[PDB]
């Protein structure tokens, strides 16, 4: 999944390699390579990298069902992890299955 | 008693072809997937109702508790869709179907209305609880359970649903217990 | 509509089976059979006769083992309370294993809930809930011509 | 087995005036397992059968 | 250099041996390559749910 | 343990995608260049710290205006929440969501989760 490029990761990534590719210090056609080995890797250290759980509530707005993708943006709604808690009014949700 | 009315199911035409994904995306409280159904689901929080969109231009509303309101929920949905740019007519907006509940206020013997009605009424305990007194003159299925609350169903207009209670009423009062 | 017409056939002896005794020898949901049933009766036209819960007293009480006089003592509990309507609710064979465990437990041959609710299939909680129901008419539910062997006072709540 | 399915004794008697027949219920237990290597080896039983 | 060239004509040859593949599809295969064009389509405009967020992102970036 | 995760990351995928580089044809010098364009871009927006910054009928115009704005569903600076959804459930306009996998943003802070459940009404 081209998934996470867009992620602040993923676009400090391709910024670099625009970059390499303006000065032709380095080229298309490799920087797709490239992306495609960047998309496998976040892919795997996603799913086995560890994770933590916890329960919550919220109010919607719109919704989205695409490829198996759902989209979700809802309104005024605050989200706690563990001790932490975070107030919100805004927020958008993409979740894949 | 008078029955409260709690569903309008309408169908209202909107002219012409529309291309059901661009729905989707634009529209906010707008689902449309495929494999499940094959019509875009779009709901509205001010009058209450969730409406089914079809590809081929007809409109399917659900959720209104009153006439006037389904009207009104139905051209709400008309113009959200034309705000879009498809061209957009509104057509025969006919209500299909009315559901309707009450309560008598007194506890009712369902066995004995099968033994003297068994032509008009079938009952079945382990299926449903309830007895159906399908009726002929007024088409209307009534459901009735022991405690004492009527649900009349399938009236296309709002005098159907008011005669057929005051019909089953006689009935209920002559079995009461 | 074997098993449909199987189900007829008990009522139209006078002596149904449950549903959840035809599904044990059928693939087919209770639901379908159901459905199946309705086709057919309206398929067929023919009327029906409704259930009582003495019907069953027989094989149930047989599979505890329990002797004719708690099997009859059942009974007229059980006839006792849907002449005065004390649950106008619960399924009757649910009323009726409420009964037996009533009964059960007006005898030595006391069993627990949950192996009554085991043979008649219903829930342990809609038999705790239908004995709640007659429990209130427990001692004057029973029938003339019986020995306690527990008082009514003594009668268990749940 | 009575015509509505309730089981009782019969004794030699009844059997000759009703035109019956003396005889017993046979069972056995029997267990199933299902071999297919698929990383276990699944069995059950279903006794008195 | 050159060696690219003949890989590019070599590529037209394989898209070549596809329209036999369509002939053998024809004549059987084709509910599978249905459903791969299935689950490309999924990929595919999937990135494109993906792809909404980096136009809002260079938006203020 | 956040800026943690991402150090862990972001060496991972450059250690991951050397070979890469090399078997198209590419001096180590770039590679340490995307290295550095990469951690820059994190440290110029200071979202938090790391060590590599410290180094009628037919017309429809009779109905007036329902439909409310789309635009204010997109800001580009909202909360995004990047996670896999389990199972999403719905009854009348009751919603149930069970989530997981999720990197949370919330507040300007960022939070991590294998599994978050929520509800709301639409």
Same mark, same amino acid.
């Given at each position: 999944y081209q998934l996470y490029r867009n992620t602040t990761l993923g676009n400090s990534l391709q910024e670099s390699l625009d970059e390499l590719i303006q000065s032709q210090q380095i080229t298309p056609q490799l920087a797709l390579q490239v992306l495609l080995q960047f998309d496998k890797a976040i892919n795997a250290a996603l799913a086995q990298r560890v994770r933590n759980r916890v329960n919550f509530r919220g109010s919607l707005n719109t919704y989205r069902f695409c490829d198996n993708v759902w989209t979700f943006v809802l309104n005024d709604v605050e989200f706690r992890e563990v001790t932490e808690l975070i107030k919100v009014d805004k927020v958008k949700i993409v979740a894949c299955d | 008693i008078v029955p409260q009315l709690q569903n309008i199911v309408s169908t209202v035409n909107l002219g012409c072809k529309l291309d059901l994904k661009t729905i989707a995306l634009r529209a906010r409280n707008a689902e449309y997937n495929?494999?499940?159904? !094959?019509a875009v689901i779009m709901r509205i929080r001010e009058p209450r109702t969730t409406a089914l969109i079809f590809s081929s231009g007809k409109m399917v509303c659900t959720g209104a508790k009153s006439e006037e309101q389904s009207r009104l929920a139905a051209r709400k949905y008309a113009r959200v869709v034309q705000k879009l740019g498809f061209p957009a007519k509104f057509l025969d907006f006919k209500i299909q179907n009315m559901v309707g509940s009450c309560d008598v206020k007194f506890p009712i013997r369902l066995e004995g209305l099968v033994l003297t009605h068994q032509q008009f009424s079938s009952y079945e305990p382990e299926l449903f609880p309830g007895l159906i007194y399908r009726m002929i003159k007024p088409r209307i299925v009534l459901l009735i359970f022991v405690s004492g609350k009527v649900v009349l169903t399938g !009236?296309?207009?709002? !005098?159907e649903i008011y005669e057929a209670f005051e019909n089953i009423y006689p009935i209920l009062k002559g079995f009461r217990k | 509509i074997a098993s449909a017409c199987l189900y007829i056939a008990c009522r139209q002896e006078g002596v149904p089976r449950t549903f959840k005794e035809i599904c044990a020898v059928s693939r087919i949901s209770k639901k379908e059979i159901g459905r199946c049933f309705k086709l057919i009766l309206k398929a067929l036209e023919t009327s029906v006769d409704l259930i009582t819960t003495g019907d069953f007293m027989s094989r149930f009480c047989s599979n505890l083992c329990l002797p004719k006089q708690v099997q009859m003592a059942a009974t007229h509990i059980a006839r006792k309370a849907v002449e005065l309507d004390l649950v106008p609710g619960r399924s009757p064979i649910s009323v009726a294993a409420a009964a037996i465990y009533m009964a059960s437990q007006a005898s030595a041959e006391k069993r627990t809930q949950k192996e009554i609710g085991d043979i008649a299939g219903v829930a342990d909680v809609t038999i705790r809930q239908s004995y709640r129901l007659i429990y209130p008419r427990a001692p004057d539910l029973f029938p003339t011509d019986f020995k306690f062997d527990t008082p009514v006072d003594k009668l268990p709540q749940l | 087995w009575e015509r509505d399915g309730a089981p009782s004794p019969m004794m030699p008697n009844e059997a000759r005036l009703r035109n019956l027949t003396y005889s017993a219920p046979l069972y056995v237990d029997i267990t199933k397992t299902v071999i297919k290597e698929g990383e276990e080896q699944l069995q059950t039983q279903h006794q008195k059968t | 250099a050159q060696l690219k060239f003949f890989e590019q004509l070599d590529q037209i040859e394989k898209q070549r041996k596809d329209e036999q593949e369509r002939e053998i599809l024809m004549r059987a295969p084709e509910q599978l390559r249905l459903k791969q064009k299935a689950k490309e389509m999924q990929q595919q405009e999937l990135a494109q749910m993906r792809q909404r967020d980096a136009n809002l992102t260079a938006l203020a970036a | 343990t956040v800026p943690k995760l991402y150090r862990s990351v972001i060496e991972d995928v450059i250690n991951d995608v050397r070979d890469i580089f090399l078997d198209d044809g590419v001096d180590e010098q770039v590679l340490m260049e995307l290295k550095t364009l990469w951690e820059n871009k994190l440290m110029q927006s200071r979202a938090v710290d790391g060590f590599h910054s410290e180094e009628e009928e037919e017309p429809l115009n009779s109905e007036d205006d329902v439909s409310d704005e789309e635009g204010q569903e997109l800001f580009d600076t909202e909360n995004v929440v990047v996670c896999q959804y389990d199972k999403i459930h719905r009854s009348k306009n009751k919603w149930k969501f069970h989530l997981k996998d999720g990197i949370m943003n919330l507040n300007g802070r960022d939070y991590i989760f294998s599994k978050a459940i929520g509800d709301a009404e639409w």
């Open positions: - | 495929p494999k499940r159904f !094959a !009236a296309k207009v709002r !005098a | - | - | - | -």
